[PDB]
Amino acid sequence: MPHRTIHLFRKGLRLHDNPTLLAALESSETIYPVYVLDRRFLASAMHIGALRWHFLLQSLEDLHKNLSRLGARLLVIQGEYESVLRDHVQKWNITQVTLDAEMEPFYKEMEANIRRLGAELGFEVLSRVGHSLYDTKRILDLNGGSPPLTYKRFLHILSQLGDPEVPVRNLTAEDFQRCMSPEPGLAERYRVPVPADLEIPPQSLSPWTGGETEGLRRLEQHLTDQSTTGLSPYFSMGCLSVRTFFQRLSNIYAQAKHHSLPPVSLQGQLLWREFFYTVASATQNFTQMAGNPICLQIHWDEDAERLHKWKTAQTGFPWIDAIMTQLRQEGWIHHLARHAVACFLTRGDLWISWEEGMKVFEELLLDADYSINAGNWMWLSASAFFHHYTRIFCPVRFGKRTDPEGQYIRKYLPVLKNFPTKYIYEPWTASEEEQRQAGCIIGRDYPFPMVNHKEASDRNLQLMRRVREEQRGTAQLTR
Numbered sequence: 001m002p003h004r005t006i007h008l009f010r011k012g013l014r015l016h017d018n019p020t021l022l023a024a025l026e027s028s029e030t031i032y033p034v035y036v037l038d039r040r041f042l043a044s045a046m047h048i049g050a051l052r053w054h055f056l057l058q059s060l061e062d063l064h065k066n067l068s069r070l071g072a073r074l075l076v077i078q079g080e081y082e083s084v085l086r087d088h089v090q091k092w093n094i095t096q097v098t099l100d101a102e103m104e105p106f107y108k109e110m111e112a113n114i115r116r117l118g119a120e121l122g123f124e125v126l127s128r129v130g131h132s133l134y135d136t137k138r139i140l141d142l143n144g145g146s147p148p149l150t151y152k153r154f155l156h157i158l159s160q161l162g163d164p165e166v167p168v169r170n171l172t173a174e175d176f177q178r179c180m181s182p183e184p185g186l187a188e189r190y191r192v193p194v195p196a197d198l199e200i201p202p203q204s205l206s207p208w209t210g211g212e213t214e215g216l217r218r219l220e221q222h223l224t225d226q227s228t229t230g231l232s233p234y235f236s237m238g239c240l241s242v243r244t245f246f247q248r249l250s251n252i253y254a255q256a257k258h259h260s261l262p263p264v265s266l267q268g269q270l271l272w273r274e275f276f277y278t279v280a281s282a283t284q285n286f287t288q289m290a291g292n293p294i295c296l297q298i299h300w301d302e303d304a305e306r307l308h309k310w311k312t313a314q315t316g317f318p319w320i321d322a323i324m325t326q327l328r329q330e331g332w333i334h335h336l337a338r339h340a341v342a343c344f345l346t347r348g349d350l351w352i353s354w355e356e357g358m359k360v361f362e363e364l365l366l367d368a369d370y371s372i373n374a375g376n377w378m379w380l381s382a383s384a385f386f387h388h389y390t391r392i393f394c395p396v397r398f399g400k401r402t403d404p405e406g407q408y409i410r411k412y413l414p415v416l417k418n419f420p421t422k423y424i425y426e427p428w429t430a431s432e433e434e435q436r437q438a439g440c441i442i443g444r445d446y447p448f449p450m451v452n453h454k455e456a457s458d459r460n461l462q463l464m465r466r467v468r469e470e471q472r473g474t475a476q477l478t479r
């Protein structure tokens with residue numbers, strides 16, 4: 001097998017079900033498994049908070065450990081991807097560059113640029129899809145060329161397509177004997193960087209640890225303990241294959257003689273992911289409002305202070321602030337916690353663009369996912385997909401049903417930990433003497449509520465009603 005190959009990890013930070021890396025190994029005599037840490041590209045294309053960096057560095061360290069166990073290595077190269085490639089195609093006499101075929105426009109532009117560079121430097125470019133359950137083009141083809149815009153129509157198309165794609169085989173030590181992974185000269189240049197190298201606090205205090213190893217452990221541990229799986233960061237980073245997880249769930253359904261539906265329900269979660277991936281792959285301007293053909297055009301308020309309070313857990317609604325605090329401190333929050341804060345920010349209370357919430361979630365979520373994040377933010381703002389706009393989450397009462405003593409609030413907002421339960425969700429209703437007894441003066445130690453919920457939601461309902469009465473055709477696209 002003739003090629004000398006660089007495999008570029010972008011997502012797909014895993015050795016199981018990695019079709020591109022497998023294709024690289026099967027076509028090559030020499031391989032350099034590379035992660036390019038390109039601060040300029042990342043600065044131009046995304047927003048990445050400290051917890052996300054920690055999770056990435058952990059996933060890269062794990063990939064390096066796992067590659068090393070097979071007699072290979074991970075090479076982390078810090079630089080601009082085009083200049084890195086020009087240098088190392090020369091250094092290593094590269095004839096093929098492989099990379100996962102991601103659907104995100106910034107990854108597609110990178111891929112386009114690498115293919116142009118290949119035509120110039122003399123390397124072929126090979127990419128395989130490892131991020132989706134289905135061949136997205138086949139879904140579009142069955143739907144007439146456009147993406148299904150409802151989950152119902154999506155499931156109808158999938159029922160014509162059949163089963164998802166199956167995972168490819170695991171990589172073996174024998175793969176790296178047939179296709180050698182040479183130790184480059186100056187191999188210290190290619191170490192996974194430590195947090196200090198990224199100007200980031202050295203201690204990761206998120207209960208999540210990145211990497212394929214932990215993703216697989218969690219995956220197997222969830223199937224043993226059985227609250228959701230908590231696997232989203234691993235799917236978003238590609239430490240875990242959705243095709244592998246889907247098939248694992250099919251295996252359980254098979255061993256239960258088709259009598260266990262909880263694995264089927266969980267497969268449905270992956271199908272929601274596929275739904276948004278499919279819409280996102282074929283919709284112009286998917287991650288913004290303007291120019292987005294499925295998105296209601298809503299004159300959201302430009303109020304950076306309102307956004308600032310929401311982002312920094314200073315809304316004065318403890319349920320909202322506790323959730324935003326968990327997001328900031330841990331990088332993951334439950335699906336319905338995301339509903340609560342996203343509705344509050346957008347159609348419910350603050351009337352701030354879903355684009356701004358999306359960007360905050362992008363910075364803070366370990367599982368930040370281009371397609372999922374935008375699709376769900378359009379959903380939670382009733383900009384597309386969701387149409388029950390008279391239903392607004394109550395930032396006080398929703399948590400009361402869930403957690404009447406406010407243990408979650410007391411955990412994430414310790415300033416409120418001594419508030420009697422009758423005030424824990426609305427501490428501004430306590431008398432000043434009760435505030436003094438709790439050791440927490442509202443407006444000083446914890447803010448007053450930034451809006452009157454009833455007034456704000458009343459006003460926003462009227463605005464949303466006008467939008468939907470005027471933009472009927474756009475609303476109907478996703479109904």
Ligand SMILES: Cc1cc2nc3c(=O)[nH]c(=O)nc-3n(C[C@H](O)[C@H](O)[C@H](O)COP(=O)(O)OP(=O)(O)OC[C@H]3O[C@@H](n4cnc5c(N)ncnc54)[C@H](O)[C@@H]3O)c2cc1C
Binds near residue numbers: 229236335367370380
């Ligand atoms: C405003 C908002 C923003 C969101 N942003 C993201 C994001 O950036 N990344 C992300 O992975 N999820 C996002 N979600 C979806 C959802 O909240 C998370 O996928 C889920 O909380 C992850 O927890 P889990 O892995 O335990 O999920 P499980 O219930 O165990 O689901 C298994 C997997 O299915 C997928 N999935 C589950 N729910 C959804 C959904 N509603 N839409 C699409 N895929 C889904 C995820 O890959 C998840 O890991 C967002 C939801 C909202 C409302």
Ligand SMILES: [Mg+2]
Binds near residue numbers: 227228229266269
């Ligand atoms: Mg679930």
